[PDB]
Every structure is written in structure tokens, then in C-alpha cells.
């Protein structure tokens, strides 16, 4: 427990944020203590911001140069000077609120200097502003209208759709409409995007899009462009896997099987080609401990910052300092940076707490902890999930107080490895009993069993099909859970291998359908 006075002495960090949030939620921050407090908050977002704003609303913040502009309304905007008129017309809701005669007037006013404003004003004088903006091929207007309302939907011709990728909004547009299976005319139109005009994630999602319309040759061309342009080897491998699945070129599979990235795709390719399992590093420090406190959340925030700012030389000093059994998770974390992310570290710390579970359970626990925290006992997420297994306070308290009735339980007990692994086992029993597959369990661990149940109830998810279950894995509608599932599944395969309880990843894939 930390008073606001003592917290204010600590460096700004997620740990300090968490402990400030704990005071706010227990009503221990007075209006007077609240006055300076946002200079003490490292990430002023979500619940900490809503809680603080209940004590001290934000009057902030309109830019003082344009103050006067915000004194007009739709009824008086024709009395405003030209700068004021153009500032207020940045808002499409403001434009929508205008009467049509004033939209006509303002459109004429702005036609020479701001034809973008003209196009939007006249668009809103029609019953379908999107159709007007599309006829003009006003790309900036298109994205403004999309951000205003996701309900507009229209066919887009080859020329227009090939202009969209140059706008910063394209990537989120494409991803959202493909994954959410919305805006079907937009989605169908995006089949005519030239792969030459897209790259990376956008190219990849356009591949996925093409597969949903069974346009396999277009899909291949998008995935090939993605494989060529993606920065990360793990993403390139995902793209190459699709190239292989669609066109069956055995050079694509061979390239995938020789990847330096360990991921589900490279593991699968290795299995299909009878390639040996990738080499896993063995870390076995003989030193037992050092002076570092693995149970101090503030100390972790500080050493993490140091490690991530350390030059090649400082990483070697830190490596030596943390080369002990007690600080093994910090050691592996340092080595991962020091070796430029080329070696595979799959540690098993605090193993005494799980050695009596069966090996398949051990592997799933380890797989989850590796992705959740990298085994850092005092890990804290941006949403204040806690410890090695990244329990949200709600769940920690439900399990620790309601279910297990641990005397004097506090959510900070999640920072103790014994508790993290015990609670993790407890919750994984609940999930696995309902879902079975380690991939589904992973999705429910990160995203909730409600989300997972709803996804699996759909007719179009994890059912039989030409490109299943891989296609479904690309369409998991929450990006954090989609990524999380792929990573945890790879880790699970590795840990099962390391525990002498190997499973073929092909058997996992068969059990998904």
C-alpha cells in the first residue's frame, strides 16, 4: 500500500499509474490531492482518466486562436468571418446540421480555395453524400465520410479503389471492413486493387478478402506482395504460408520451413517437410541470486526502461548482472535484445509450482505466461492486468476471494509466481473444460469466453472448408486475440516438445474444425 505522497516520489510509469488508480477506485484521492495529479500519470488513458475526471473535470481544451469560432452555431455561422467558417466546417456533424441553403452559399464561397469543403457541403445537400463524393473521386472526402459514418456503402470502380491505398486511413478501413464483414459493396470493390498499389498488412488483408470471394489467383498475388513487403519475418511467413496453400509451389514451402522465425507457419512447414524441430536455447545460470527484488513493481519499470534504451555494449553488462536463477526472466529478456531477436528462448522459471501438473497443462501454462509477461512477476499491462499470467483485478479477486477464500487476499498477490501459476491453472481448467482446443482456450483467456463462444457459434468460423482452419484464424474479429492465439499456439507446441510430450501441429489444426 502506497500513500499518494510516496507515489509522487516515484518515477512516472505504468506501476505508478496502477497504484494511483488503486487509490482512486477506493476513493482515497481528495480534490486537493487531485490538483497536480496528471503530471504524475504516465499514460493518461482509459479508467485512470475517467476516474480522475470524476474528481476534476477537464475544462480543457480549445486552441485560444480559434476560441471565437466555437461561439457560432449552425444558425449564426453565416455571420462568422471566413477563418471561423472554415474551422467549423472541419466537422461533418457540423455540416450535416446546416440548412441546405447555407450549404449552397458556403459551397460557392469556398469553391476556389477549399474545393474539399465545397464537395462535402454539396454532398450533404443530397440524400447520399457518399455517392456524390465517390462521383467526384474526392479521396480525402471519402475517408472523412467513412469516419463520420460506417453505414455508407457503394460500389467503387477500378480507378477510385486504386487511389484509396495512398491515404493514411486506408489500412484501418480495409482491415475493419474485411474482418467485421461489413460494407459488402466496398469489400467487393477492393478485389480490383492492383497489388502493385498496396503492401504489408493492407496487401495481406486484401488477400484474405479475395479468398472470401474465392478469387484464389488474386489472393495469391496480394499475399505475394505482402510476403515481399512485410518488415517482420513472422508476418512474411504468414504470407508465404498462404502463397503455398493456394498455389502449392514447393519452393514457397521450403522457404517457410527454413525461416529464422519460430511461428505456427514455420513449425507447420517443418513438420510437412520432415525438417528437424528448431533449436531452443538452454539457459542454466549457476548464480542463484543477486540484489534485485523481483517482487518490486517499481524496480521492474526502471530496469525495463534501461534495458530497452541500452546500446549493444550496455546490454552485455546487464546480461552479466542478471545472469542468475532468481532473475532468469530478466536475463532471457536481455538476451532476446542482445542477439537481435534471432535465438529462441523458452524458459521455465518457478517450475516447482507446476511440475505436478500433467505435461500438456504445464505447456499451456508456460505458453500463456511467455506471451502474457515474458515471465516477469511484476508485469503490468496498460489495462493493469497483473503478474506472469496477466490477470485483470476483477478475475484475480473473484478467484482469490470468492472462490478460494484465501485469507487477507489482495490482487497484488498475482505478482507472486506461486499464485500466478495456481490461478492460471484454475482458470485454464474452467476454459479447457468448455473449449478443449488450446487455440480456443488462448482466445478465451485473452478475449473472454463470451467473445469466443459467439465467434464459434458463427456458421462461417472454424467449420469445414477448403482453406480451414487457417482462414478462420485470419478472421478472428478482435486483433489482439487473433495475434495472441497464433503466438500462444506456437509457444504451446514448443513447450510440449521441450517437456518430452510432443504433439504434431497438424493434429491441433485437425481438431479446430
The binding site for ligand ZIA (CB under 6 A) comprises 371-374, 379, 381, 385, 390-392, 395, 445-446, 448, 480, 484
Q: Which is nearer to ligand ZIA, 141 or 329 (CB)?
A: 329
Phi-psi region of 390 (alpha: psi -120 to 50; beta: other; left: phi over 0): left
Q: Which is nearer to ligand ZIA, 18 or 268 (CB)?
A: 18
Biggest alpha carbon distance in the chain?
81
Rounded to 10 degrees, the C-alpha dihedral 285/290/292/294 comes to 50
Q: How far apart are CA 81 and CA 497, in angstroms?
A: 71
- Minimum CB distance to ligand ZIA, residue 478 (Å): 9
Q: Which residue is nearest to ligand ZIA (CB)?
A: 448
- Minimum CB distance to ligand ZIA, residue 239 (Å): 20
Q: Which is nearer to ligand ZIA, 344 or 374 (CB)?
A: 374
Rounded to 10 degrees, the C-alpha dihedral 37/39/41/42 comes to 180
- Minimum CB distance to ligand ZIA, residue 306 (Å): 16
- Minimum CB distance to ligand ZIA, residue 256 (Å): 23
Q: Which is nearer to ligand ZIA, 377 or 469 (CB)?
A: 377
Residues 6+ apart with CB under 8 A from 125: 100, 103, 104
- Minimum CB distance to ligand ZIA, residue 259 (Å): 21
Q: Which is nearer to ligand ZIA, 196 or 480 (CB)?
A: 480
Q: Which is nearer to ligand ZIA, 268 or 300 (CB)?
A: 300
- 20 SS3 class: helix
- Minimum CB distance to ligand ZIA, residue 49 (Å): 18
Which regions of 371-443 does DSSP assign to beta strands (E)? none
Whole-number Cα distances in Å, 159 to 50, 154, 197: 45, 14, 12
Q: How far apart are CA 112 and CA 101, in angstroms?
A: 19
- Minimum CB distance to ligand ZIA, residue 309 (Å): 16
Q: How far apart are CA 411 and CA 19, in angstroms?
A: 12
- Minimum CB distance to ligand ZIA, residue 513 (Å): 25
Q: Which is nearer to ligand ZIA, 281 or 480 (CB)?
A: 480
Q: Which is nearer to ligand ZIA, 111 or 374 (CB)?
A: 374
Whole-number Cα distances in Å, 186 to 161, 164, 498: 9, 11, 47
Residues 6+ apart with CB under 8 A from 398: none
Task: Count, in order, helices (H) and strands (E) of the chain.
Answer: 29, 0
Written as one string, the DSSP assignment of 264-295 is: HHHHHHHHHTTPPPPP-----------S--TT
Q: Which is nearer to ligand ZIA, 238 or 371 (CB)?
A: 371
- Minimum CB distance to ligand ZIA, residue 38 (Å): 22
CB-based burial label for 219 (10 Å; 0-12, 13-18, 19+): buried
Q: How far apart are CA 431 and CA 94, in angstroms?
A: 48
Amino acid at each position: 500500500q502506497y500513500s499518494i505522497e510516496k507515489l509522487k516520489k516515484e518515477e512516472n510509469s505504468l506501476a505508478k499509474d496502477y497504484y494511483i488508480y488503486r487509490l482512486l477506485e477506493k476513493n482515497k484521492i481528495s480534490k486537493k490531492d487531485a490538483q497536480d495529479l496528471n503530471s504524475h500519470i504516465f499514460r493518461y488513458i482509459g479508467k485512470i482518466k475517467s476516474e480522475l475526471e470524476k474528481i476534476i473535470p477537464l475544462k480543457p481544451y480549445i486552441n485560444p486562436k480559434y476560441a471565437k469560432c466555437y461561439t457560432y452555431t449552425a444558425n449564426t455561422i453565416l455571420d462568422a468571418n471566413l477563418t471561423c467558417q472554415s474551422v467549423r466546417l472541419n466537422s461533418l456533424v457540423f455540416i450535416a446540421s446546416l440548412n441546405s441553403k447555407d450549404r449552397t452559399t458556403l459551397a460557392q464561397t469556398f469553391k476556389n480555395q477549399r474545393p474539399d469543403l465545397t464537395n462535402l457541403l454539396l454532398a450533404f445537400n443530397t440524400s447520399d453524400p457518399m455517392s456524390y463524393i465517390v462521383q467526384k473521386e474526392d479521396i480525402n472526402g471519402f475517408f472523412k465520410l467513412y469516419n463520420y459514418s460506417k453505414k455508407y456503402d457503394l460500389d467503387l470502380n477500378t480507378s477510385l479503389v486504386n487511389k484509396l491505398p495512398n491515404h493514411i486511413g486506408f489500412k484501418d478501413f480495409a482491415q475493419n471492413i474485411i474482418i467485421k464483414k461489413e460494407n459488402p459493396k466496398f469489400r467487393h470493390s477492393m478485389l480490383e486493387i492492383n497489388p502493385e498499389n498496396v503492401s504489408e498488412d493492407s496487401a495481406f488483408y486484401l488477400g484474405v478478402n479475395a479468398l472470401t470471394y474465392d478469387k484464389t489467383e488474386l489472393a495469391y498475388d496480394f499475399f505475394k506482395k505482402a510476403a515481399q513487403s512485410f518488415k517482420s519475418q513472422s508476418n512474411k511467413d504468414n504470407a508465404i504460408f498462404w502463397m503455398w496453400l493456394i498455389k502449392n509451389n514447393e519452393e514457397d514451402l521450403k522457404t517457410l520451413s527454413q525461416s529464422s522465425s519460430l511461428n505456427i507457419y514455420s513449425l507447420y512447414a517443418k513438420e510437412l517437410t520432415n525438417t528437424p524441430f528448431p533449436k531452443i536455447e538452454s539457459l542454466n545460470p549457476s548464480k542463484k541470486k543477486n540484489n534485485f527484488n523481483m517482487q518490486d513493481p517499481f524496480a521492474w519499470q526502471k530496469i525495463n526502461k534501461q534495458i530497452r534504451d541500452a546500446n549493444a555494449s550496455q546490454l552485455d553488462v546487464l546480461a552479466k548482472e542478471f545472469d542468475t536463477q532468481e532473475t532468469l526472466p530478466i536475463y532471457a529478456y536481455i538476451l532476446e535484445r542482445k542477439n537481435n531477436f534471432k535465438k529462441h528462448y523458452f524458459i521455465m522459471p518457478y517450475y516447482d509450482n507446476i511440475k505436478d501438473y500433467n505435461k500438456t497443462r504445464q505447456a499451456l501454462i508456460l505458453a500463456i505466461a511467455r506471451q502474457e509477461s515474458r515471465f516477469i512477476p511484476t508485469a503490468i499491462s496498460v489495462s493493469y492486468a497483473l503478474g506472469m499470467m496477466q490477470f485483470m483485478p476483477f478475475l484475480a479477486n473473484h478467484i482469490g476471494e470468492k472462490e478460494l477464500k484465501i485469507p487477507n487476499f489482495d490482487q497484488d498477490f498475482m505478482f507472486k509466481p506461486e499464485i500466478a501459476y495456481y490461478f492460471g491453472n484454475y482458470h485454464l481448467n474452467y476454459l479447457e473444460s468448455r473449449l478443449k482446443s488450446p487455440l480456443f482456450v488462448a482466445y478465451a483467456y485473452n478475449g473472454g469466453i463470451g467473445f469466443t463462444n459467439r465467434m464459434l457459434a458463427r456458421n462461417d468460423m472454424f467449420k469445414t472448408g477448403k482453406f480451414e482452419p487457417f482462414l478462420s484464424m485470419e478472421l478472428v474479429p478482435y486483433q489482439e486475440s487473433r495475434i495472441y492465439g497464433k503466438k500462444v499456439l506456437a509457444n504451446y507446441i514448443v513447450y510440449r516438445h521441450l517437456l518430452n510430450d510432443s504433439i504434431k501441429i497438424s493434429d491441433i489444426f485437425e481438431n479446430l474444425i
